[PDB]
Design a protein around this motif. Structure first.
Motif, PDB file in Angstrom:
ATOM      1  N   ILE A 133      69.741  18.307  46.852  1.00  0.00           N
ATOM      2  CA  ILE A 133      69.098  17.103  46.336  1.00  0.00           C
ATOM      3  C   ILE A 133      68.534  16.280  47.492  1.00  0.00           C
ATOM      4  O   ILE A 133      68.975  16.416  48.634  1.00  0.00           O
ATOM      5  CB  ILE A 133      70.081  16.218  45.529  1.00  0.00           C
ATOM      6  N   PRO A 134      67.540  15.421  47.210  1.00  0.00           N
ATOM      7  CA  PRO A 134      66.918  14.578  48.236  1.00  0.00           C
ATOM      8  C   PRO A 134      67.951  13.724  48.959  1.00  0.00           C
ATOM      9  O   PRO A 134      68.833  13.144  48.328  1.00  0.00           O
ATOM     10  CB  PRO A 134      65.933  13.734  47.434  1.00  0.00           C
ATOM     11  N   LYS A 135      67.836  13.648  50.280  1.00  0.00           N
ATOM     12  CA  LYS A 135      68.774  12.867  51.077  1.00  0.00           C
ATOM     13  C   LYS A 135      68.759  11.398  50.668  1.00  0.00           C
ATOM     14  O   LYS A 135      69.777  10.712  50.757  1.00  0.00           O
ATOM     15  CB  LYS A 135      68.439  12.986  52.564  1.00  0.00           C
TER      16      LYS A 135
HETATM   17  N1  LIG Z   1      67.228  16.160  51.906  1.00  0.00           N
HETATM   18  C1  LIG Z   1      66.336  15.407  52.546  1.00  0.00           C
HETATM   19  O1  LIG Z   1      66.517  14.994  53.691  1.00  0.00           O
HETATM   20  C2  LIG Z   1      65.063  15.073  51.791  1.00  0.00           C
HETATM   21  C3  LIG Z   1      64.811  13.578  51.723  1.00  0.00           C
HETATM   22  C4  LIG Z   1      63.752  13.154  50.705  1.00  0.00           C
HETATM   23  N2  LIG Z   1      62.463  13.871  50.973  1.00  0.00           N
HETATM   24  C5  LIG Z   1      63.564  11.643  50.779  1.00  0.00           C
HETATM   25  O2  LIG Z   1      62.643  11.137  50.103  1.00  0.00           O
HETATM   26  O3  LIG Z   1      64.345  10.992  51.505  1.00  0.00           O
END
Ligand SMILES: NC(=O)CC[C@H](N)C(=O)O
Ligand SMILES: NC(=O)CC[C@H](N)C(=O)O
Ligand SMILES: NC(=O)CC[C@H](N)C(=O)O
Ligand SMILES: NC(=O)CC[C@H](N)C(=O)O
Ligand SMILES: NC(=O)CC[C@H](N)C(=O)O
Ligand SMILES: NC(=O)CC[C@H](N)C(=O)O
Ligand SMILES: NC(=O)CC[C@H](N)C(=O)O
Ligand SMILES: NC(=O)CC[C@H](N)C(=O)O
Ligand SMILES: [Mg+2]
Ligand SMILES: [Mg+2]
Ligand SMILES: [Mg+2]
Ligand SMILES: [Mg+2]
Lengths: 150, 150, 150, 150, 150, 150, 150, 150
Positions: E29-31
């Motif tokens: 999932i997105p950080k």
């Molecule tokens: N797992 C990640 O580091 C992705 C982060 C994601 N792209 C954001 O908007 O922060």
């Protein structure tokens, strides 16, 4: 007391209704000597008396209970509780034992109600009494306290 | 049994050596009627017999112990242990009680050594026996099992 | 009460919603006689009433506890504690037992919190109470107190 | 279930012999709605049935005993013992509790002898049974399991 | 909380020193979403904080004891004793349990002497305390209270 | 370890999310020295790690139980049972104690049903297990195992 | 203390009546060095003295009892009871133990009567004493407290 | 043995390092008579020997434990366990007691680890052993087994 007295007592503990004849014939001694020995045993306190053995069942003494009683410690509480327990109607045995370090009380009653009224309720009102545990005897496998010579 | 039989038994439970005269005079009934009533009580099983009361102390029965015994459950183990306990020399009482759900055994011995040899060691070798707890009686406050009528 | 009343009670203890017809046909007796017998049993106190059997689970009575309570000895402490226990909401059973020589209390609550607030906390504030031990029922294998005739 | 069902159940748990009229008048709702609600409660399992409350004393059920039973650990011994206990004549309650971690058994018998023959002796022969402790109920302060709504 | 939060917590309960990257890559999932979810869990009280796990042995905490404490019944004695126990230096756990119906106290000390001075002696002087039983832990087979998600 | 390490640990045991700045400012030492000391404590095993403290309530871990377990004696039965207990899901603590001479097991579950299925039922099937007693925790007065420095 | 002192003590703990010669020859060291080492051990408190080992049986000390004593909690009751117990004639050992959390008292008497008069009766009158349990030693399998070096 | 021997023993039980002069002067008897009496007591077995009293603390014997051991019943299990217990390194006392009807074992070790390795672990592997309870002595109020004459 000698070996002969023991043979006499071993007989009298079972049946005190024998005749000086039978006993004398069995022990093989003069009836006059027997009568003397027996009278001596009574005077000396070996033979404290003669009782009729009544079958408790015949008196409907169906509710038998062995109760352990713990007395609070301090100022003569222990000794006083013992005598209070021994005066309760229906109580025939009171022993102080080492280990449990409490009193063991043997009692007999016709019913649960009598037991509660004469024993339990009374014992509960005794302040010295710390705790109790009453064991219901549902089977008498043996009860011959009269047999002291095996 | 009637009120009169009870008055007779109340006397005989304490002292069976009275004369039919004294008793008859006390109860206020014909000596021939007394003799009859007493003979009837014996035939009916109320009076199972007459014993001599021997002072256990006079026989050096100083080591008194009340032992609780737990029998393992299963295939008639309980009933068999009861009879094994009642045949041990020195054991005069064996009761099965509800609550503790175990046997209570009353025994008397002259010394610790006799107790160990005749009772303890023997009981320990019984496989059916789960556990035991032997209470040492250090004081007999009362022991009058003969008194069934209060 | 006779054999016939027992056959009637054996039925009513399970289902009191039967018709005098069915019962009469099963017992093989006049419906008018049945109605009479049943009315007599109620007047005599054998049948104290008729209740609806409500499934405790349906009421979220998930926290069931059987508590043993020891009362301090002395001046009517025992009898008073019994009635105090029986008035606690959620408590449906209170028994005084011989052996443990304490009260056994049966109670039902929806949750642990209710149990603590209505039962435990209240019982703890009772000075007469010596000690308690609350047993959590995690499984009801059987509970049919209505069945008195087997 | 809603508040109204509870008011209905609170009544039926005490007396199921009321008329739909009285109840309807007390609850203040149409008799047709009541009859419906009650029929729904029965179909839903809230009301499992209707029983006649028989006074145990009227049946001479004088020997009441609450027994704790410990089962040996291992291969389904626990679950099997529970069902064996529930099938014993005279046993109306069997609970497995957390804490004591054993079974609590409620039973009723006319006499000590019946209790021994139907319950005790049978339980003793069960090998899975580790130990037991049977508590004699000498006083029922309260016993209203039918009251589920306080 | 959803399935994803659980996956996050399952990780953080073991090691809170991971980078949002690694976790995000593992959970997929997105950080930014992770950071959000974690911040939400903290604000909601699921994650109450982050601690350093210190090896008790490294601090010579060799005398570990689990003590059961019985409080006298009556006027708020129970609740007051609980807080008194929790303020004792070295005590990290205090629980009130149903069954034993007493407090269970977990404590750690460097030596017997410290334990006696800081815990035992102090607990003994508390009047509310009825009795205690201190269990000496001689072996920690497992102690991972941090693992709440299995 | 020196006095300074203790001041560091005393902080990290409560909150491991502080910045090396704050800590350094509080302890009054160079941030580079702090970072070093902390890294040394981790390499030396004093600091075994860093965990997230999850509120058990947030996970519906409402059924908490402290269970004592007695293992049968003989051929490595004791040591084997310990590891079997520690692998049970929901069990976070297993201690062998001197006195009771048995295992103390700490476990957490969402409900009674889960507890029975994952812990109780499993423990009952273990043959080595002699007996058990499961204590229901109805109140957590304190639970801070993370606090090792007072 | 060094390895040599231990070899000396291992000998003196069994028999202190050896000659400096024999010991010196056995330990293989100068008699003057031995005498010095022994004098140093006495000055340092390792060797507190030399006693004659008297066979308790030779003094008719037949009634041996190990008694556990529970003291009431609160205002220095515990510490005071300990010293009261140690001053009782016939008492040679008094230990406070963790677990039972009570005093263990070792005593020896010639008879039951002496034990009751000097120990039991006295202990019972102590108000601080909560409860006691006196264990009768019927067999000394071993008693060599003098052997401190194995 | 006479009154004079007792005066001699009362001295030797405390300090066996006195000179025949001092003792003779105190007892007021010829030194040659004293020497004779003492030699007679040794030949008769009253004085079994002379030991050096070593301060257990001086040997770091900090972990003192009094353990009760229950042996399974049947085929000489009891007597065999007693001797097995007496041969364990660190065990100086083994008594079989009436009441608890089990063995009481006195042992001393430098640390918990030694105790576990030499005593606990070994005792646990003994199949005859039913159960045990090890009491940790945290305070020696008195320990003077050498004093047999009060
Ligand atoms: N797992 C990640 O580091 C992705 C982060 C994601 N792209 C954001 O908007 O922060
Ligand atoms: N056994 C007997 O009756 C003999 C009695 C004996 N000849 C006497 O002098 O009395
Ligand atoms: N009490 C008595 O001795 C009277 C006896 C009575 N006259 C009879 O017929 O035997
Ligand atoms: N079982 C029945 O309904 C018969 C009734 C019976 N004939 C009467 O007199 O009421
Ligand atoms: N309480 C009553 O009897 C009213 C009944 C209602 N009128 C009906 O429709 O049945
Ligand atoms: N507390 C601080 O941040 C000082 C740091 C210190 N000057 C160093 O060398 O890192
Ligand atoms: N063992 C001995 O007696 C030798 C003694 C030694 N030569 C000394 O100087 O005393
Ligand atoms: N007390 C003494 O030394 C006297 C000794 C005494 N004269 C003897 O014959 O040995
Ligand atoms: Mg008689
Ligand atoms: Mg009903
Ligand atoms: Mg943590
Ligand atoms: Mg000595």
């Amino acid at each position: 007391m000698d070996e002969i007295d023991l043979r006499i007592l071993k007989i009298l503990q079972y049946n005190a209704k024998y005749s000086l004849d039978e006993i004398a014939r069995e022990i093989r001694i003069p009836k006059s000597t027997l009568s003397y020995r027996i009278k001596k045993l009574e005077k000396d306190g070996v033979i404290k008396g003669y009782y009729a053995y009544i079958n408790p069942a015949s008196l409907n003494l169906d509710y038998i209970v062995i109760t352990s009683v713990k007395a609070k410690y301090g100022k003569n509480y222990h000794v006083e509780l013992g005598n209070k327990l021994a005066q309760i109607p229906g109580v025939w045995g009171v022993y102080f034992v080492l280990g449990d370090n409490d009193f063991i009380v043997m009692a007999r009653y016709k019913t649960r109600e009598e037991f509660m009224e004469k024993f339990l309720e009374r014992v509960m009102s005794i302040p010295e009494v710390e705790r109790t545990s009453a064991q219901v005897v549902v089977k008498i496998i043996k009860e011959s306290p009269n047999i002291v010579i095996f």
